[PDB]
Amino acid sequence: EKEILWNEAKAFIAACYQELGKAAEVKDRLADIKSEIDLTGSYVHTKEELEHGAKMAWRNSNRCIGRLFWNSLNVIDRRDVRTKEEVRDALFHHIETATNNGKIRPTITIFPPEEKGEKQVEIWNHQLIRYAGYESDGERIGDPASCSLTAACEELGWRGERTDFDLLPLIFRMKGDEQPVWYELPRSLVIEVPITHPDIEAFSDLELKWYGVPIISDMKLEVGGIHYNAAPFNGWYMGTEIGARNLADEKRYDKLKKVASVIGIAADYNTDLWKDQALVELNKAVLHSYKKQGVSIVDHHTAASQFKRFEEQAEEAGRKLTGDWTWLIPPISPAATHIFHRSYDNSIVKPNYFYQDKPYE
Amino acid sequence: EKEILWNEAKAFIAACYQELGKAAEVKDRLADIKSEIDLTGSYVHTKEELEHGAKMAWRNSNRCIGRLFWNSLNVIDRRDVRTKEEVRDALFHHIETATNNGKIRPTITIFPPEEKGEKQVEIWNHQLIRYAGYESDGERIGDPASCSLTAACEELGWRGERTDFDLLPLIFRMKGDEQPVWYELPRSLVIEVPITHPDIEAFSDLELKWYGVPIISDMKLEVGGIHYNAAPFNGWYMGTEIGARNLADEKRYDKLKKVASVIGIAADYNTDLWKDQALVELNKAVLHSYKKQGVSIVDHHTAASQFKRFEEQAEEAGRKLTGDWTWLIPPISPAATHIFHRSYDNSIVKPNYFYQDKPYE
Ligand code: HEM
Ligand code: HEM
Ligand SMILES: CNCc1cccc(OCc2ccc3ccc(N)nc3c2)c1
Ligand SMILES: CNCc1cccc(OCc2ccc3ccc(N)nc3c2)c1
Ligand SMILES: C[C@H](O)[C@H](O)[C@H]1CNc2nc(N)[nH]c(=O)c2N1
Ligand SMILES: C[C@H](O)[C@H](O)[C@H]1CNc2nc(N)[nH]c(=O)c2N1
Ligand SMILES: [Cl-]
Ligand SMILES: [Cl-]
């Protein structure tokens, strides 16, 4: 266990300090760490290490098209929190600062890491801002992806209004508590964007909306053998995540048939490509709506052009590029991007963000 | 060498005869084959084996979405050919019978297999029907994918008219000849489809067309250790191959900017998703045009629904399914198909079709 930790620490510190121009400081820092492990079973990252590790982890995320901006990640160090009111307030603050009145700042808030594999803080939310979903007899309301978390919140005394867009409460558990606690999101903190279309007036009849900032809160950040299981982060949306998946997937909001109706085309024949046409108009609407409201968003073409620059930058820096082609291609017109036409090495490099088991389900 | 052949033969004959309900005939057939190899260095497939192997090979082609119809493949046995006039006439016949006045019959014509690794017939064409491509000083004409074969044909005394749609001649080489021969395609054999749009009259201004039948002629069919390096086959097109790739790719005909102009939208801003919209209209046009002319074609949604039935049929038959997710997803709206949302085992099972080195380049 100390072995695993010490090895990961050596590899991380060497790489981190080398990138920071601090290679001469490695030996002594490794000494102090070597001693810290032996005596304590673990080690504490300096603020520099933690900030740079979170950035490296984003840089190494094979499935992320948005990596060009890895080095400008805003890292908030909240390893000092000890109470659920502090965790709540840190989560609220992250929402406010990341949102930044619509000019989204990619941000991560880092909570105390696991100790003996024992979590200090365990966040139940998949994103800090997400819509509830309900499925009783016949009745399908809200986001189906949220059905199991929604049902767990309602087990704890929360009750949703059962609109298609109920905001789930924040829900997390403190070490030593048997049950999580939940806190309703202050609506003043949550920017939402009504979906309208630039040319088609009737599009507002769909009464679609989405929230401004995706803040993924259920992954584990690993840096130098330290497991930060609670470390929510956000970028800005790529439009297709909303228009081609959240609002379009049959198992999510399933809106293509309704889009086809409001844009005035038939939804009767596959050869009419009505789904494709509906997708393009819905995705135009999403980009238009976010831009009109002054909320950051990127389209999949601009995003892919940025990712090409990330590839070029990787090569120029002497770093291997890794990537997961199946996740990097956009779900709309993928062959119109350069990503589609090359292959990527899907190797896992640490620091990195990882999946971890849900505590509901 | 005999070892490799004999092993592949045992595996193929057992599987083939089992599927044909002829399991009791295996032992004796294996005996005759065992003897045939020892005495001759090779073995000759019965007509049943060859027909069933070509069908199995299609069934095992991981990258093919059209596999539902594997068992109805029309197999033409041309292992009897010895002269270049016979090969020419067999290739002409394949075009005529596969085209079938627009009601395309999936067909394969099988030529004599390699003997000592020595080819009896070597087809240079990538497809029997394809357009030439030219690239001299600044000037880009026709299909860039055809530039190297076009240049090789012109080395042999062929001359293209240098339209954007010159039909390449058939070109192949006989064992014992140093150079291939080439034969102009009779225009009466080649169905072409002018691309028009159902709603947008101006679309014909683009003067786009494509040929009716893709007849892939440069892959190797392997069956029971026998290498049929010359075995051209065809299905019908899936519309996206023409509309999303052949006519759309920057390195192919690169028509999206011109499509955007004729459909009356600006091609200035990525956030307008003009490429996506152009793709959808071009792909609607392709499907419409083939249907209007009575030439077989499938759209990517219908095709994916058929592939779902192929998956179900595989399971019901007790056969492992294999597939290459990266090639099975359509290049237009892939997340609208079930294919996108599952994974596939990309293992290689024989019989199968394989890439082989070009003899030009
Ligand atoms: C700056 C804006 C950003 C954009 C536009 C962007 C875009 C994307 C997209 C579209 C995906 C695919 C999501 C899916 O299909 O479910 C993704 C995956 C990912 N992104 Fe980014 N991203 C951004 C910033 C970030 C940041 C700041 C981090 C972390 C510090 C991050 C880490 C990841 C990770 C870990 C995944 C993979 C998640 C998984 O395996 O399920 N991204 N990104
Ligand atoms: C019946 C109509 C058929 C349709 C609609 C169809 C559809 C497709 C498509 C769209 C591809 C991908 C091509 C690309 O992206 O370049 C493909 C690949 C393939 N198909 Fe089919 N196909 C059909 C029939 C056949 C037949 C009859 C065979 C052989 C007997 C075949 C064997 C293959 C093979 C080997 C590939 C992979 C080629 C490679 O690796 O480059 N298909 N098919
Ligand atoms: C439950 N859906 C799968 C799943 C599980 C865990 C994390 C995750 O993250 C997707 C993800 C992660 C980071 C992102 C950053 C920016 C962005 N626009 N999308 C992003 C999307 C997705
Ligand atoms: C040169 N492009 C790559 C390359 C090399 C060799 C074969 C090949 O075949 C693609 C292919 C093969 C069979 C097909 C059958 C039907 C169809 N509609 N498309 C089909 C497309 C593609
Ligand atoms: C090598 C690279 O992944 C390449 O662009 C592949 C991707 N998927 C594909 N899928 C299909 N159907 N056809 C192709 O030509 C390709 N090209
Ligand atoms: C497992 C299966 O391949 C799955 O549908 C993947 C495919 N590629 C993807 N790509 C992105 N960007 N997001 C996803 O959720 C998925 N899902
Ligand atoms: Cl999302
Ligand atoms: Cl083609």
Side-chain angles (χ1 to χ4, degrees):
Chain A
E1 69 286 26
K2 293 199 182 173
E3 284 175 25
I4 293 80
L5 178 66
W6 171 235
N7 294 135
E8 295 285 359
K10 288 190 282 167
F12 166 70
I13 293 298
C16 177
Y17 277 41
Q18 178 174 327
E19 290 179 25
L20 297 183
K22 290 184 161 209
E25 310 190 16
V26 172
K27 301 316 165 179
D28 275 59
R29 176 52 175 166
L30 284 188
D32 300 342
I33 291 183
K34 185 47 186 61
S35 148
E36 184 167 8
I37 294 176
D38 292 336
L39 300 174
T40 82
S42 192
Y43 78 101
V44 172
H45 284 129
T46 68
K47 286 181 166 297
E48 246 201 345
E49 284 158 5
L50 179 68
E51 166 180 351
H52 197 67
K55 291 172 164 182
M56 290 168 82
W58 180 10
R59 189 174 76 207
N60 289 321
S61 299
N62 292 5
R63 293 173 167 179
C64 177
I65 195 170
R67 286 181 279 163
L68 178 63
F69 306 112
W70 66 273
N71 198 29
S72 54
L73 183 64
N74 172 35
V75 179
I76 301 168
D77 172 13
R78 285 322 300 285
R79 289 175 296 163
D80 54 315
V81 310
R82 299 296 183 264
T83 75
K84 45 181 66 75
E85 296 86 12
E86 289 167 335
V87 170
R88 178 199 56 211
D89 293 346
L91 293 174
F92 284 168
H93 172 83
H94 185 131
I95 291 171
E96 181 181 80
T97 185
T99 298
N100 192 27
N101 298 124
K103 221 198 133 57
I104 297 173
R105 288 184 278 243
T107 303
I108 176 166
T109 294
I110 296 177
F111 289 105
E114 301 179 343
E115 293 197 2
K116 46 178 54 180
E118 183 178 21
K119 302 176 194 297
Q120 305 308 288
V121 185
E122 177 184 53
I123 298 170
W124 288 31
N125 304 85
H126 160 65
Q127 296 175 27
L128 301 187
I129 304 172
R130 233 194 179 191
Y131 300 130
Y134 312 82
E135 163 72 338
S136 88
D137 37 21
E139 210 162 28
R140 215 159 311 174
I141 299 173
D143 191 340
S146 290
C147 279
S148 51
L149 178 55
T150 300
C153 290
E154 299 203 309
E155 284 298 306
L156 298 159
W158 183 77
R159 176 72 180 192
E161 283 167 57
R162 288 169 161 66
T163 76
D164 277 333
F165 303 109
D166 295 347
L167 297 173
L168 282 170
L170 293 183
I171 163 168
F172 61 90
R173 186 185 60 77
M174 300 304 295
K175 171 185 63 179
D177 289 340
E178 183 160 329
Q179 292 306 328
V181 285
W182 59 265
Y183 301 99
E184 200 65 44
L185 290 169
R187 304 274 311 186
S188 64
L189 284 183
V190 176
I191 286 195
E192 291 179 295
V193 178
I195 306 307
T196 59
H197 188 282
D199 312 309
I200 300 171
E201 198 83 45
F203 209 94
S204 46
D205 295 340
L206 294 185
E207 300 183 71
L208 300 175
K209 66 178 180 187
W210 204 256
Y211 47 88
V213 194
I215 313 174
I216 277 62
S217 53
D218 66 359
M219 293 184 85
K220 160 177 293 170
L221 165 65
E222 183 179 347
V223 173
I226 302 304
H227 291 243
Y228 299 94
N229 65 284
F233 53 85
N234 68 280
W236 48 79
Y237 265 117
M238 187 164 76
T240 56
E241 298 175 86
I242 300 167
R245 306 297 313 281
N246 296 346
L247 294 177
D249 278 2
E250 287 179 16
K251 286 181 156 71
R252 301 295 301 288
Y253 283 77
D254 193 20
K255 297 292 183 170
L256 292 184
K257 183 110 172 53
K258 285 167 180 212
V259 169
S261 179
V262 298
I263 74 174
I265 63 179
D268 293 331
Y269 302 92
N270 288 343
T271 49
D272 286 342
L273 306 189
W274 65 264
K275 289 191 178 169
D276 312 82
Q277 186 166 344
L279 282 160
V280 174
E281 298 302 335
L282 177 54
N283 278 276
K284 279 162 68 186
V286 160
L287 293 165
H288 164 72
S289 301
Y290 275 65
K291 165 80 164 80
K292 180 172 99 173
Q293 190 158 321
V295 181
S296 296
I297 189 156
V298 65
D299 65 275
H300 51 291
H301 306 287
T302 300
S305 294
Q306 288 163 345
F307 188 66
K308 177 89 175 77
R309 295 183 46 209
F310 173 73
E311 302 181 25
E312 292 158 357
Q313 157 191 116
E315 181 70 342
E316 296 167 359
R319 289 187 294 265
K320 306 276 196 52
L321 175 71
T322 58
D324 186 340
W325 187 98
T326 76
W327 280 60
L328 292 168
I329 56 155
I332 289 308
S333 305
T337 70
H338 79 283
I339 294 171
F340 184 94
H341 304 266
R342 57 157 293 177
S343 61
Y344 294 89
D345 171 29
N346 195 24
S347 302
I348 306 306
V349 187
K350 291 173 176 181
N352 213 327
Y353 298 98
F354 296 94
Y355 284 180
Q356 52 189 341
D357 291 351
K358 294 172 175 179
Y360 52 103
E361 298 176 9
Chain B
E1 69 286 26
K2 293 199 182 173
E3 284 175 25
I4 293 80
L5 178 66
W6 171 235
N7 294 135
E8 295 285 359
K10 288 190 282 167
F12 166 70
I13 293 298
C16 177
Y17 277 41
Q18 178 174 327
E19 290 179 25
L20 297 183
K22 290 184 161 209
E25 310 190 16
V26 172
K27 301 316 165 179
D28 275 59
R29 176 52 175 166
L30 284 188
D32 300 342
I33 291 183
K34 185 47 186 61
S35 148
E36 184 167 8
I37 294 176
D38 292 336
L39 300 174
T40 82
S42 192
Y43 78 101
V44 172
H45 284 129
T46 68
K47 286 181 166 297
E48 246 201 345
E49 284 158 5
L50 179 68
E51 166 180 351
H52 197 67
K55 291 172 164 182
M56 290 168 82
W58 180 10
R59 189 174 76 207
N60 289 321
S61 299
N62 292 5
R63 293 173 167 179
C64 177
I65 195 170
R67 286 181 279 163
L68 178 63
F69 306 112
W70 66 273
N71 198 29
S72 54
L73 183 64
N74 172 35
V75 179
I76 301 168
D77 172 13
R78 285 322 300 285
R79 289 175 296 163
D80 54 315
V81 310
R82 299 296 183 264
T83 75
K84 45 181 66 75
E85 296 86 12
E86 289 167 335
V87 170
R88 178 199 56 211
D89 293 346
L91 293 174
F92 284 168
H93 172 83
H94 185 131
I95 291 171
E96 181 181 80
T97 185
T99 298
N100 192 27
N101 298 124
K103 221 198 133 57
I104 297 173
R105 288 184 278 243
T107 303
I108 176 166
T109 294
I110 296 177
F111 289 105
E114 301 179 343
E115 293 197 2
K116 46 178 54 180
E118 183 178 21
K119 302 176 194 297
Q120 305 308 288
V121 185
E122 177 184 53
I123 298 170
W124 288 31
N125 304 85
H126 160 65
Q127 296 175 27
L128 301 187
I129 304 172
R130 233 194 179 191
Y131 300 130
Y134 312 82
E135 163 72 338
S136 88
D137 37 21
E139 210 162 28
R140 215 159 311 174
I141 299 173
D143 191 340
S146 290
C147 279
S148 51
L149 178 55
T150 300
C153 290
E154 299 203 309
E155 284 298 306
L156 298 159
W158 183 77
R159 176 72 180 192
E161 283 167 57
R162 288 169 161 66
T163 76
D164 277 333
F165 303 109
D166 295 347
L167 297 173
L168 282 170
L170 293 183
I171 163 168
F172 61 90
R173 186 185 60 77
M174 300 304 295
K175 171 185 63 179
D177 289 340
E178 183 160 329
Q179 292 306 328
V181 285
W182 59 265
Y183 301 99
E184 200 65 44
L185 290 169
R187 304 274 311 186
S188 64
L189 284 183
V190 176
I191 286 195
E192 291 179 295
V193 178
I195 306 307
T196 59
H197 188 282
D199 312 309
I200 300 171
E201 198 83 45
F203 209 94
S204 46
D205 295 340
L206 294 185
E207 300 183 71
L208 300 175
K209 66 178 180 187
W210 204 256
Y211 47 88
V213 194
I215 313 174
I216 277 62
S217 53
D218 66 359
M219 293 184 85
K220 160 177 293 170
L221 165 65
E222 183 179 347
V223 173
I226 302 304
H227 291 243
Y228 299 94
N229 65 284
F233 53 85
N234 68 280
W236 48 79
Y237 265 117
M238 187 164 76
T240 56
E241 298 175 86
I242 300 167
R245 306 297 313 281
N246 296 346
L247 294 177
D249 278 2
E250 287 179 16
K251 286 181 156 71
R252 301 295 301 288
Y253 283 77
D254 193 20
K255 297 292 183 170
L256 292 184
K257 183 110 172 53
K258 285 167 180 212
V259 169
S261 179
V262 298
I263 74 174
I265 63 179
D268 293 331
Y269 302 92
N270 288 343
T271 49
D272 286 342
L273 306 189
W274 65 264
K275 289 191 178 169
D276 312 82
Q277 186 166 344
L279 282 160
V280 174
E281 298 302 335
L282 177 54
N283 278 276
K284 279 162 68 186
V286 160
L287 293 165
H288 164 72
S289 301
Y290 275 65
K291 165 80 164 80
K292 180 172 99 173
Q293 190 158 321
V295 181
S296 296
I297 189 156
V298 65
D299 65 275
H300 51 291
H301 306 287
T302 300
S305 294
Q306 288 163 345
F307 188 66
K308 177 89 175 77
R309 295 183 46 209
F310 173 73
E311 302 181 25
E312 292 158 357
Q313 157 191 116
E315 181 70 342
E316 296 167 359
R319 289 187 294 265
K320 306 276 196 52
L321 175 71
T322 58
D324 186 340
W325 187 98
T326 76
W327 280 60
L328 292 168
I329 56 155
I332 289 308
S333 305
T337 70
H338 79 283
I339 294 171
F340 184 94
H341 304 266
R342 57 157 293 177
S343 61
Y344 294 89
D345 171 29
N346 195 24
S347 302
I348 306 306
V349 187
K350 291 173 176 181
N352 213 327
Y353 298 98
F354 296 94
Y355 284 180
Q356 52 189 341
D357 291 351
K358 294 172 175 179
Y360 52 103
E361 298 176 9

